[PDB]
A paper describes a structure:
β-glucosidases (Bgls, β-d-glucopyranoside glucohydrolases, E.C. 3.2.1.21) cleave β-1,4-glycosidic bonds in disaccharides or glucose-substituted polysaccharides, thereby releasing non-reducing terminal glucosyl residues. Bgl proteins have a TIM-barrel fold. The substrate-binding pocket can be divided into the glycone, aglycone, and gatekeeper regions; in addition, the bound sugar substrate is cleaved via a retention mechanism using two glutamate residues. Four loops are present above the Bgl substrate-binding pocket, forming a large cavity for the nascent substrate to access.
Two different space groups of TsaBgl crystals containing triclinic P1 and orthorhombic P212121 were obtained at pH 7.5 and 8.0, respectively. Two TsaBgl-P212121 structures were processed up to 1.5 and 1.6 Å, with Rwork/Rfree of 0.1546/0.1712 and 0.1506/0.1762, respectively. Particularly, the L3 loop exhibited two structurally distinct conformations, one where it was oriented towards the substrate-binding pocket (folded L3 loop) and the other where it was oriented towards the solvent direction, i.e., away from the substrate-binding site (straight L3 loop). In the P1 and P212121 crystals, the L3 loop regions of the TsaBgl-Data I (folded L3 loop conformation) and TsaBgl-Data III (straight L3 loop conformation) chain A molecules, which showed the most significant differences in L3 loop conformation, were carefully analyzed. While the straight L3 loop had a relatively straight loop structure in the direction pointing away from the substrate-binding pocket, the folded L3 loop was oriented toward the substrate-binding pocket. Conversely, the substrate accessible width of the substrate-binding pocket entrance with the straight L3 loop conformation was approximately 35 Å, and the proximate distance between the L2 and L3 loops was approximately 7 Å. We speculated that the straight L3 loop conformation made the substrate entrance wider, thereby providing easier access to the substrate than the folded conformation. In contrast, in the straight L3 loop, both the Leu306 and Leu307 residues maintained hydrophobic interactions with surrounding hydrophobic residues. A Tris molecule was shown to act as an inhibitor of TsaBgl β-glucosidase activity. This molecule was found to bind to all the active sites in the TsaBgl glycone region.
Numbering used by the authors: 1 to 444
Write the structure that this text describes.
Amino acid sequence: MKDFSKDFLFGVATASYQVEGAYNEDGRTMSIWDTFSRQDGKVYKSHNGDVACDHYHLYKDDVKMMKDLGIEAYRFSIAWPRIFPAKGQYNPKGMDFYKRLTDELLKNDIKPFATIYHWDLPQWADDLGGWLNREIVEWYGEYAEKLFSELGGYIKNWITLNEPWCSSFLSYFIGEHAPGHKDLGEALLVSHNLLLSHGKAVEIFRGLNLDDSKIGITLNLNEVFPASDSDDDKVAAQIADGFQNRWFLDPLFKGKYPQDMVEYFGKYAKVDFINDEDLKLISQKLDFLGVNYYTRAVVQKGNDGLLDAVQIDPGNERTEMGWEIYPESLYNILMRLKREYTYDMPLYITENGAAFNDVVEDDGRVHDEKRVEFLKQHFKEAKRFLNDGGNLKGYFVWSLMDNFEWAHGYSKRFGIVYVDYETEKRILKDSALWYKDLISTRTI
Ligand code: NA
Ligand code: NA
Ligand code: NA
């Protein structure tokens, strides 16, 4: 038979600010990441997405490239600052790009998966308070409703948010991502307003009753292991698991924030944003969950401070991010969802991939054998989940091409396609050739 059914979606994924470029064209105004990347010290060597992969201009070549690989689905994000470059000011020229992009995908037999928000909040919105201002629920709802109305004939699979853990804790508490605040209370409120905005889009979506159309959300999830069997490390792992995973899984799928984290965070900051009405909106039924999976964490107790778990190095192989290559946690997380949160609901892997030190050799090829092996090991775990009864509908490799990796700039290469940024040349890596074979044979 086939390890992956004909209906299973082999995909690749990008995000608008990471690949598009054309940052000041056809009416687009600045996002918080345009601004953040221009603040000294925030992004590697002051890299920014002014040009990136120039995918805005090269999209026809990139779709042809995906068609020749046999790609069956393409996950991309839509740039809010192209669609509403000012508050309440719709930009048809911005919408026209996503119409010609998705028209090209459909005409080449690629199913579009559109992420509504992938971190490029318009600067006008942040200047009004951004995700800290509860009014953003209405601004986001107006944006999402415009996308549903204008693109409903083009796009049948919608993702409200990408990785709200990053938009909240990494952007407002740790401060690595835009807008770069460092305040736990702000990050917690932002996490709530993000989830409430997701809920508003779902409410609007259900009222539209679009034929054969599905909506979900994308979460980055890990698996946390205690470094030892001690009670100290067990509590440390519990907190780390609540911080990364349950803080978002529980309100979405149980209608309640995890109470151990509410009490834990409450010792350090306000948690008075929680109320029954908001959690009802947050926990509306979805059609699927998107899982972004990369690695696990091994943690031991720290200094009894705020979220101070010591990161243990188990001594295994890692990517250029320093992320352990541990494919078994892909299966473990999908199974955990099946047994604790999503049950029989369809799942997609909406991101999985790896950054390695890619070089174009004298033969003009990129022999990224570590990425070939990485993807092989993780797709084998996807196959094992399917054969054990898991409801996995597709798998999107991060990324189609090397791109702007946020605070790391262009220094981390995640693509199955190499980009020579000086010429914008695309070079298929060996991992892309391996993926092409996997799609064609559906065998691993
Ligand atoms: Na860009
Ligand atoms: Na810059
Ligand atoms: Na749901």
